[PDB]
Design a protein around this ligand. Sequence first.
Ligand code: MH0
Ligand code: MH0
Length: 106
Amino acid sequence: GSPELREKHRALAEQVYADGQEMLKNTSNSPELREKHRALAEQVYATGQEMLKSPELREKHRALAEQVYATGQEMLKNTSNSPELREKHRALAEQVYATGQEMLKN
Ligand code: MH0
Ligand code: MH0
């Protein structure tokens, strides 16, 4: 319905992915790297929601995104996030990327 919105969502999601990768390498990350990830993620969530304003694929994406976001908020309370936590995060995050891309096919 909005191509510009779709692409904005896309570009932001790519930046979320790049930062998370960077962070995945490092054993502790500056509060500045962490916060860019988080603020980027908030804009992905917001643009996606704006897009709602296959239905079953959208529903699965949205549900998945929600769980990744909530997972991430737990991680914000931690100075240090174990690779155990970081694994559940990446796993789930991969599913969000996949389903959103599966939508591109159309
Ligand atoms: C429920 C609203 C919603 C939320 C929340 C949401 C959250 C997220 N998304 Fe994402 N996403 C939403 C709705 C969409 C739609 C509707 C589409 C397909 C747009 C279209 O016009 O076909 C989409 N997302 C598409 C995508 C695509 C593919 C875009 C492309 O290559 O053109 C990616 C990578 C993506 N998402 C990632 C993410 C990530 C990461 C999050 C984590 C916050
Ligand atoms: C596998 C790479 C990777 C990807 C992709 C990724 C994608 C996403 N993320 Fe997110 N994320 C990744 C790796 C991390 C790490 C490693 C950390 C913890 C940083 C640290 O130093 O403890 C993290 N993400 C941390 C977070 C945090 C908390 C920020 C903080 O602790 O300061 C949030 C809110 C978050 N994520 C959300 C999201 C969302 C939403 C997506 C989109 C699905």
